Write a protein that binds this DNA or RNA. Structure first.
Ligand SMILES: Nc1ccn([C@@H]2C[C@@H](O)[C@H](COP(=O)(O)OP(=O)(O)O)O2)c(=O)n1
Ligand SMILES: [Ca+2]
Ligand SMILES: [Ca+2]
Length: 342
DNA sequence: GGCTACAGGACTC
DNA sequence: AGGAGTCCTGTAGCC
């Protein structure tokens, strides 16, 4: 298998750039304003000008404002970004039919059937960039290798506005010299559990006993890392089918009062049903973030599709069950729908 | 022992 | 300290 991965660079910021090029060269911070008070919320993304000075995704807008007060701060406009993304994804469809759209700004192409060797792939990646640069004036980063993981790793090493192939020898060099924390799916909690155990690099998972590693990180993550380390990871590029849709909103004040949480719950439901479109869910989950930022949720599956009016009703009962079974105040509340009708 | 549904955890961002 | 979505795991109810 040969896999080409494309990752759009600083995507939300770059779209804002394209809709207003006067922004180009200045630091740009796309934000999610929670609506508690002036500048409550977080940075969803920043362009590389802003990232130099430390303003990056996840930090609070307040923290960012300290560092770059003259930077342009823009509210997230996801609908816009999604339409730019859908257009870019169809351009990619012209270069392969086996396409896996992984997020709003990431896609894998199986380019076995389209390419013979890696240097031919690298020219294919130059074509794809320039097409996207011409058509949408969006820079992207391309990663090419033997599988999805190492193509993503390639693009991680090359962004922004980069191209890179990791050949079959490079893969073997990475197996034993890549900080295992740079492997997709290995976050901070799992990184630690690997150190607190011995494993700093992928090759190390072959020397530890399986049950010991399985004990720490779980069967699936152990099987995954092992398969990567043996160079036997080969998972297919397959079309991703959306499995759930939902909305969570931040309330202006924390609360355990049913009657003042309800309006936010109901808006989240109205917004979620719009977004559902023609999809009919058989399952609903109410999700709350407590004041100490812990996530609590209750859900029910139905032997039939959930009408909006049933959503309204079941959601209050599920919310009541949260209030009853968990004693902490609620800060954020929404819903999530799943198990769609086929 | 092994299957299915839930509620939480971890990760991608 | 926002918002969205996925896969995985421990537990319980049931063959
Ligand atoms: N915590 C984060 C991280 C990234 N993002 C958004 C969501 C995702 O679609 C987009 C991708 O990130 P971006 O292109 O800015 O940079 P990178 O590719 O993530 O380095 O940023 C977010 O909303 N929240
Ligand atoms: Ca990305
Ligand atoms: Ca990106």
């Amino acid at each position: 298998m040969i896999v080409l991965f494309v990752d759009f660079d600083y995507f939300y910021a770059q779209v804002e750039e394209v809709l207003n090029p006067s922004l180009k060269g200045k630091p740009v911070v796309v934000c999610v304003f929670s609506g508690r008070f002036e500048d409550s919320g977080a940075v969803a993304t920043a362009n590389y000008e802003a990232r130099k000075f430390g303003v990056k995704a996840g930090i609070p807008i307040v923290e960012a404002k300290k560092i770059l007060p003259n930077a342009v701060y823009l509210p997230m406009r996801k609908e816009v970004y999604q339409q730019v993304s859908s257009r870019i994804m169809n351009l990619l469809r012209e270069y392969s039919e086996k396409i896996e759209i992984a997020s709003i700004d990431e896609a894998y192409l199986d380019i076995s059937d389209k390419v013979r060797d890696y240097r031919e792939a690298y020219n294919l990646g130059l074509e794809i960039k320039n097409k996207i640069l011409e058509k949408e004036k969006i820079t992207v980063t391309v990663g090419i290798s033997k599988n999805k993981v190492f193509a993503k790793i390639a693009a991680d090493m090359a962004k922004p506005n980069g191209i890179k192939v990791i050949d079959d020898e490079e893969v073997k060099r990475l197996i034993r010299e890549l900080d295992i924390a740079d492997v997709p799916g290995i976050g901070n909690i799992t990184a630690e559990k690997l150190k607190k155990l011995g494993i700093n690099k992928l090759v190390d998972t072959l020397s530890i006993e399986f049950d010991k590693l399985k004990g720490m990180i779980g069967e699936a993550k152990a099987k995954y890392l092992i398969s990567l380390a043996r160079d036997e990871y080969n998972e297919p590029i397959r079309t991703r089918v959306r499995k759930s849709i939902g909305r969570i909103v931040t309330m202006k004040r924390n609360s355990r009062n049913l009657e003042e949480i309800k309006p936010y719950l109901f808006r989240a439901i109205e917004e979620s049903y719009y977004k559902l479109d023609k999809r009919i869910p058989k399952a609903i989950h109410v999700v709350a973030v407590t004041e100490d930022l812990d996530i609590v949720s209750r859900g029910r599956t139905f032997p039939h599709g959930i009408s909006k009016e049933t959503a309204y009703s079941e959601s209050v009962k599920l919310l009541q069950k949260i209030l009853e079974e968990d004693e902490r105040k609620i800060r954020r509340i929404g819903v999530r729908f799943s198990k769609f009708i086929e």
